[PDB]
Design a protein around this nucleic acid. Structure first.
Ligand SMILES: [Mg+2]
Ligand SMILES: [Mg+2]
Lengths: 133, 229, 51, 88, 52, 51
RNA sequence: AAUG
RNA sequence: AGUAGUAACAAGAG
RNA sequence: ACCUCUGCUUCUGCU
């Protein structure tokens, strides 16, 4: 959807200085530490095996209720649901050459954004934040 | 003090108490105090939950294959928290932060037991310092002084048997001069232990550079001298 | 063969654990040519780690 | 349907390691019952020093109890389940 | 700038130097960790190559 | 692990790496080691055949 | 500014 | 033969 | 046995 509802601009040729920075690859629903996100996934999918309750259940109660509403009556096996929930909660942060934009909606199109000698003006779909603005 | 525990409790209670100590990284052969405390705790939790039963209509009786209480204390930590998560998620009662010792299917409440030696109301309020109104309470002591919870349903047959067992345990501890071992604390650190055997010590001795006879000479030469220049 | 050739000027002995023939080049003699030598000096390594 | 897996290399059927086939399929059955009882075992690593039979027997006993306390079993099939668990 | 390669790197090192390194690095550690970190150079200084 | 069980070496049941490495370096002091290996036993089948 |  | 290159294949096993 | 298995499945010892 962020690809489809996007618009493209001019392409310019000229020098580009890329700086290798540690950026977030894909945008997230909510950025959590991996053990806290594992506790969230165990509360969403396998609630009778979550073990000792943390304090993360009270912070993330609306996310758990929403994600239990959305995955209501599906027949997809829970290992795939856990893989996709871990895909949309746990961050992937890697070192990439970045010139210009480093938000995750631009890092997911960094291959077609700019190169070493060209730049492409691009604006993704969705809605941009306020801290990034 | 271990033949006391060997003759006074069944093998199941002793094995469960030893595994309970081993889960918290302790040693049962070197601490009979904590082993005795967990054996007394499990014996109380099993005598209370001995023969209370709900029938197909759900009426309790003390004399079926569905008991009134489910024992959480005694099982391994992952299994006991599985039982607590399941019983909290099924009946709708909110999951407590800590691990209760029994579950009552009639009141449908988590019943936590404590064991003290002084004022039962004192240990009652010591538990209420950290619990709140999330569990029930069954506090007992060795001198016929109990303190049950304000929404309790404990009868007086098991209340006779529990205090009779506690007083008989106290009398047999004092008869063989063993209460003095339980007054004092058997405190030692269960630090990480790693003993080098015979072959690996010989291999480490012969695996030193040229100029050293054993390994401790090389180790103290590394630690002591200053090789500057 | 190449491992024992580059360290044959060290201390040879027979192990009293397994029985095999062991060679010790560490704190052996200093080299005299540009052959690959495995005679590492212990004080030089300890001075490097201390720096 | 394009996430298939290739077949196992069957060169071991002629060597001296054919018992390691059976020795694998004795393991797998046990694990394929364990993830039946503990569904989170594929996502979470199971922790514990107790046996693999004790954990499964306790999980099956609690499942049968919370089945009979919700009407999802009979009064007779509950007796069959608890008799089998009394054997185990 | 020297563009360099190291010849005979695996044959000319020593487990007896790595033992001294694991005794120098773990100076201020407990004794059990110093006995743990000084077993891999011991098993590597007495290794036996199977030929093939 | 299944061969260490036959020698009263049980650092794998406790679940940590440190008791397992303790049993590893204590198996070097064991005078004998028992393990599971595989031999072969031959068998005659009569038929209508040659040789 | 980060999130190992 | 040939591929190949410090040692193999040019079918192996029952 | 013009029968069967195999195509990355490792050979210390049964040899
Ligand atoms: Mg408890
Ligand atoms: Mg280079």
């Amino acid at each position: 959807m962020r690809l489809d509802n996007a618009t493209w601009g001019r392409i310019t040729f000229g020098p580009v200085e890329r700086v290798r920075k540690r950026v977030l690859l894909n945008p997230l629903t909510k950025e959590m530490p991996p053990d806290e996100a594992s506790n969230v996934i165990m509360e969403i999918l396998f609630p009778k095996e979550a073990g000792i309750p943390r304090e993360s259940t009270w912070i993330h109660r609306e996310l758990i209720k929403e994600k239990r509403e959305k995955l209501k009556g599906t027949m997809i096996t829970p290992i795939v649901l856990a893989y996709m929930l871990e895909r949309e909660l746990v961050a992937r942060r890697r070192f990439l050459p970045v010139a210009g934009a480093t938000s995750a909606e631009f890092i997911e199109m960094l291959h077609c954004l700019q190169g070493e000698n060209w730049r492409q003006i691009y604006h993704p779909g969705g809605n941009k934040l306020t801290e990034s603005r | 003090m271990d033949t006391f525990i060997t003759r006074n409790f069944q093998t199941t209670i002793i094995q469960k108490a030893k595994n309970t100590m081993a889960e918290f990284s302790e040693d049962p052969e070197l601490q009979p105090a904590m082993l005795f405390n967990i054996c007394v705790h499990l014996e109380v939790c099993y005598v209370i939950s001995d023969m209370n039963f709900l029938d197909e209509e759900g009426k309790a009786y003390t004399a079926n294959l569905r008991p009134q209480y489910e024992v959480i204390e005694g099982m391994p930590r992952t299994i006991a928290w599985m039982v607590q998560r399941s019983l909290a998620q099924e009946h709708g009662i909110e999951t407590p932060k800590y691990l209760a010792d029994l579950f009552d299917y009639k009141t449908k409440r988590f019943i936590e037991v404590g064991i003290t030696k002084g004022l039962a109301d004192d240990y009652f309020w010591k538990k209420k310092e950290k619990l709140g109104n999330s569990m029930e309470l069954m506090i007992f002591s060795y001198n016929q002084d109990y303190s049950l919870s304000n929404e309790s349903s404990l009868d007086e047959e098991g209340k006779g048997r529990v205090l009779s067992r506690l007083t008989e345990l106290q009398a047999e501890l004092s008869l063989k001069n063993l209460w003095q071992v339980l007054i004092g604390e058997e405190d030692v650190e269960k630090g990480i232990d790693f003993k080098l055997g015979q072959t690996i010590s010989r291999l480490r001795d012969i695996s030193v550079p040229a100029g050293f006879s054993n390994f401790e000479g090389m180790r103290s030469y590394i630690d002591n001298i200053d090789p500057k220049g | 063969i190449r491992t024992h050739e580059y360290s044959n000027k060290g201390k040879q002995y027979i192990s009293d654990v397994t029985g095999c023939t062991m060679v010790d080049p560490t704190n052996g003699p200093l080299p005299e040519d540009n052959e690959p030598s495995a005679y590492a000096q212990l004080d030089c390594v300890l001075e490097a780690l201390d720096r | 349907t394009h996430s298939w897996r290739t077949k196992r290399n069957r060169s071991i059927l002629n060597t001296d390691q054919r018992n390691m086939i059976l020795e694998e399929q004795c393991y797998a059955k046990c694990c394929n019952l364990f993830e039946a009882c503990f569904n989170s075992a594929s996502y979470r690593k199971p922790v514990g020093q107790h046996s693999m039979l004790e954990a499964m027997a306790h999980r099956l006993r609690m499942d049968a109890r919370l089945d009979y306390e919700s009407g999802r079993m009979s009064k007779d099939d509950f007796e069959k389940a608890m008799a089998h668990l009394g054997e185990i | 700038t020297v563009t360099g390669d190291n010849t005979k790197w695996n044959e000319c090192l020593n487990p007896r130097i790595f033992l001294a390194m694991t005794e120098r690095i773990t100076r201020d550690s407990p004794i059990w960790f110093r006995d743990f970190c000084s077993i891999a150079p011991v098993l590597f200084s007495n290794k036996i190559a199977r030929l093939g | 692990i299944t061969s260490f069980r036959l020698n009263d070496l049980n650092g794998a049941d406790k679940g940590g790496l440190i008791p397992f490495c303790q049993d590893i370096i204590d198996s070097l002091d064991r005078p004998e080691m028992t393990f599971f290996s595989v031999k072969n036993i031959k068998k005659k089948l009569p038929a209508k055949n040659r040789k």
